[PDB]
Amino acid sequence: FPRVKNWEVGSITYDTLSAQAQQDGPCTPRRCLGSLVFPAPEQLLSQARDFINQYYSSIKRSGSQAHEQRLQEVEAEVAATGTYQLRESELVFGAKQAWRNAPRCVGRIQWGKLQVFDARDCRSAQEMFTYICNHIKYATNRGNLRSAITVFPQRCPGRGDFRIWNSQLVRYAGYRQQDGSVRGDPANVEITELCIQHGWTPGNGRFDVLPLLLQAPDEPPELFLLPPELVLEVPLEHPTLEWFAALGLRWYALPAVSNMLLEIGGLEFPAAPFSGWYMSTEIGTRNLCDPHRYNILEDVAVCMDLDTRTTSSLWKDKAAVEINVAVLHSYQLAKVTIVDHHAATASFMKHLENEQKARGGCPADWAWIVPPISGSLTPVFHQEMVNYFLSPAFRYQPDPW
Amino acid sequence: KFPRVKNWEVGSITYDTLSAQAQQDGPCTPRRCLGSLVFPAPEQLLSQARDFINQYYSSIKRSGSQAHEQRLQEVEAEVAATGTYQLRESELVFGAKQAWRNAPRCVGRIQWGKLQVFDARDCRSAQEMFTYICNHIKYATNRGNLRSAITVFPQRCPGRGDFRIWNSQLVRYAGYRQQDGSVRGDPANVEITELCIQHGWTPGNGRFDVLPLLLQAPDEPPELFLLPPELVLEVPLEHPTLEWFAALGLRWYALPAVSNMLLEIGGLEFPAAPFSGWYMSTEIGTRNLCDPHRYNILEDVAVCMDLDTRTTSSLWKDKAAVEINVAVLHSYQLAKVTIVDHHAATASFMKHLENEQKARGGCPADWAWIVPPISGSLTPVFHQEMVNYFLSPAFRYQPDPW
Ligand code: HEM
Ligand code: HEM
Ligand SMILES: Cc1cc(N)nc2cc(-c3ccc(CCN)cc3)ccc12
Ligand SMILES: Cc1cc(N)nc2cc(-c3ccc(CCN)cc3)ccc12
Ligand SMILES: Cc1cc(N)nc2cc(-c3ccc(CCN)cc3)ccc12
Ligand SMILES: Cc1cc(N)nc2cc(-c3ccc(CCN)cc3)ccc12
Ligand SMILES: [Gd]
Ligand SMILES: [Gd]
Ligand SMILES: [Gd]
Ligand SMILES: [Zn+2]
Ligand SMILES: [Zn+2]
Ligand SMILES: [Zn+2]
């Protein structure tokens, strides 16, 4: 069992949950690959049993009659058909556990309070669009954001998948310009391309919300426009730099990831969009400051009259902090839920304490838990962490094209 | 077959083939990663020595030559007759530069080939040790134009005690425990401060008292050696536009000189081999002055800047840390003492990764330690994937001598 020290407090724990790591990560005793972004019917039965036992243990009913009857039901269904279906309560338990097991998520103190929408009876792309609109409506909640997930029908062999082609439900278009540069979000050139080849009329703003490319089984992707009143947006302004508003920046309220595969008890749900609320550094540092994103850092530093000729005036650092101040101020002014990285990491430290009692550990990816600015000023920087893969899980998947 | 490593800011892809030489086993396994942990006979020696000899002769393009064969024979024979062998001076120089070049946590490795190696293997007493150390400090400091250096004292050998430097750095500030439970000075040094006091040092009572050296000669109790004040170059800390900052009374020293690691070369161990470079500014501003178990000035600076400290969403911590770092870089440049900011240091590390891919087919690097402690994603190493593994020659930790 690995020893795990918090060097701030001096406190020691042992991670016994890691003993139950499902599959294999990328590291070996010869070399560590922890910074890498992307590393049978018998097999399905074995995972279904594991998961059913997990569910029945978590409610303190292991060995009960209902437990035995559920296992027998799954054995019979897998024998007859090669698969099985989850009861709604097992689906709820599974989607929560997948969030709880997500090593790169700093927001897991919230894992128990997730709303799960059962969309497994969904039949068409049009019907899928209705579920996604209900989800966005519920999750946004006029700016009082609420974590949620909508689970579309499971994969089954010999049948096409439901897929959401967009990587997130709300994204800004990125139009390639005459000279090889992008107008809008450059992280989205390929998805913007696909939208136009499928009949979308593009715009030319920096903040044009993309349509949804939805794919029902074996049917090609169908274009769906999101009603503007449904996408809540926040104009970015700064509390003391009056000119910041004039940059015309803005961002959307709802981070809604739509390209991951949910895996529960050997079943796979390729369309299972989920959402929560933002940590400010995601917007301020990643989306507005990364050189491959909106890359505004130089423009802000000019407006602040900073000496941008030498790296040692720390103009990049000054400009980055004020952008993050503007994000927090604008979301709070607009009454849209947001959390700063100091509050987020403090709550994640509490989540680690809770998880040690409940399960004897917590899988955590240190490079993604530590915020991308002011790392060592947060309590997670000096916290040793163990990374391993538990099931249920969210997983990356190949693109649908 | 070989790990593929991507830079997500440029899109470039390399394959790390040097990891196949990995001469040790780290803490990770296929089932869990522990890459964030801080602290994870004759033919054993002969095999490590032969691999080191092979490296040296490959480096000067002379593999398989007669000198390469003859040197292998000599080392085999020496180990057989005596249990150990002696490095030639040129191999020791190569060995010490390789140990720096192989340190996965070091961001300043672009400079690895310009290490100045001082050979103190003929040292015989603690007084002779102190003389070599004072020369090291004077050479490395160079009146503010800092220069990389390592002094290597005699290797560990059976039948004789080790040379050791009890201090973890040649230059450290005392930490005095106060009756109210708090610490005056550097809290990370309360233990070595107590030891210096037991071995006869008359303490001061300031916040930046430089500690004496505790030097141990083979099979002797350690002896105390005061550093002449003109030897230890110090920088008063001030801020270019916040005039009250000088009133905080803060200073730091010019020279980071690590003195408690063990240098390992071809199966030989040098338990006393202090080395020094120059600071990256986040080491002083963020780690030494802001960490809660160190001088812990963040909130007092934030109050003095008139920041709202009751809520975290003002980001007062981040604003105060940036200004502390500004003051560090400004102060060292004013005093004409070498210092590098984390933006310049990480850009040159990116250059080093390119150089090493051409030279050796890879570079071992601990992402968590290479990415600076503030403004991580604003530097080019944040989006650069990295492979961590142990190569030899190498610096390594060793137990404290008491
Ligand atoms: C409620 C507030 C939430 C916050 C503040 C939050 C925060 C974050 C952050 C900051 C990241 C990493 C960002 C990055 O480095 O790019 C992340 C990743 C992640 N989050 Fe959370 N999250 C929240 C809710 C959720 C929910 C509801 C789920 C799923 C049910 C979830 C699952 C994940 C997963 C799977 C990842 C990793 C994605 C990947 O590896 O690509 N999070 N989250
Ligand atoms: C020349 C300028 C140098 C710079 C700017 C520099 C910078 C750094 C930094 C920032 C760290 C990490 C410290 C931390 O995160 O707390 C480090 C670690 C380290 N440096 Fe370098 N360094 C330099 C020279 C050297 C030299 C000359 C050597 C040896 C010959 C060396 C060997 C190491 C080692 C072994 C570590 C890691 C210690 C450990 O594993 O804990 N460095 N250095
Ligand atoms: C649910 C949720 C909430 C939130 N505040 N941030 C997220 C951030 C992500 C995310 C995950 C990965 C990436 C980079 C691509 N691997 C970018 C963003 C996923 C989900 C999030
Ligand atoms: C090493 C590391 C740490 C971290 N917290 N986030 C990263 C995020 C990226 C990253 C950068 C860009 C993209 C866009 C492509 N999905 C996805 C991921 C790469 C490396 C990261
Ligand atoms: C030679 C050199 C130069 C420099 N600028 N920083 C160093 C920093 C270290 C260092 C190594 C480890 C630690 C924490 C203890 N693991 C703190 C500092 C060692 C050598 C350094
Ligand atoms: C995870 C991680 C990354 C990093 N760059 N530095 C750390 C530094 C520490 C650390 C903090 C304080 C001390 C002082 C006790 N020797 C030693 C180590 C702990 C964890 C770290
Ligand atoms: Gd069924
Ligand atoms: Gd102006
Ligand atoms: Gd002033
Ligand atoms: Zn690892
Ligand atoms: Zn980024
Ligand atoms: Zn620290």
Swiss-Prot record, chain B:
Entry binding sites for L-arginine: Q169, W278, Y279, E283, N288
Residues engaged in binding Zn(2+): C28, C33
Subcellular localization, as worded in the UniProt entry: Cell membrane; Membrane, Caveola; Cytoplasm, Cytoskeleton; Golgi apparatus
Effect the entry attributes to changing R396C: Found in a colorectal cancer sample; somatic mutation
Binding site for heme b: C106, Y397
Annotated residues for binding of (6R)-L-erythro-5,6,7,8-tetrahydrobiopterin: S36, R287, A368, W369, F382
Biological function: Produces nitric oxide (NO) which is implicated in vascular smooth muscle relaxation through a cGMP-mediated signal transduction pathway. NO mediates vascular endothelial growth factor (VEGF)-induced angiogenesis in coronary vessels and promotes blood clotting through the activation of platelets.
UniProt subunit comment: Homodimer. Interacts with NOSIP and NOSTRIN. Interacts with HSP90AB1. Forms a complex with ASL, ASS1 and SLC7A1; the complex regulates cell-autonomous L-arginine synthesis and citrulline recycling while channeling extracellular L-arginine to nitric oxide synthesis pathway.
Similarity comment: family membership: Belongs to the NOS family.
Protein name (database record): Nitric oxide synthase 3
Species of origin: Homo sapiens (Human)
Stretch of the intact protein here: 67 to 480 of 1203
